Amino acid sequence: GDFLIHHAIALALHTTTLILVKGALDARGSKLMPDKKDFGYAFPCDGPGRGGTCDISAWDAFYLSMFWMLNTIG
């Protein structure tokens, strides 16, 4: 049981890091929004064009990783 839960915590620490690292590394730009830096850290989206850009900011990857932090400390 300890083994299985430790692996669950490994998935949680790696997944929270994935979201946070993806937010930090793609903070300044991505293929979806190359000039993301020009908009700041916390902006809503870039609109419904280019397929849809909801939760595209680096703040929004903070936001999404906060659930994964709560899940892992849970």
């Binding site: 299985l4 998935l11 997944t15 994935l18 590394l25 903070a27 903070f62 400390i73």
Partner: protein, 74 residues
Amino acid sequence: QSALYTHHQYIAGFLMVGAFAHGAIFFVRDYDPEQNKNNVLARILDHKEAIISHLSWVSLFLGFHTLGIYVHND
């Protein structure tokens, strides 16, 4: 003992998520690529996709198997 452990682990998850948040804020607001040419920081951004895709792999790896073993057991 239960309250102290739970309290400090929740504080731990908040501080760790905030550290990655302010690394994202650092990249957006304070990171100058010209002043940081070919550094450890520039070269981390250069392979940002290798880092993020391997975090995606290890997250998926652990999640599929840990959940699968748990579901197998259930």
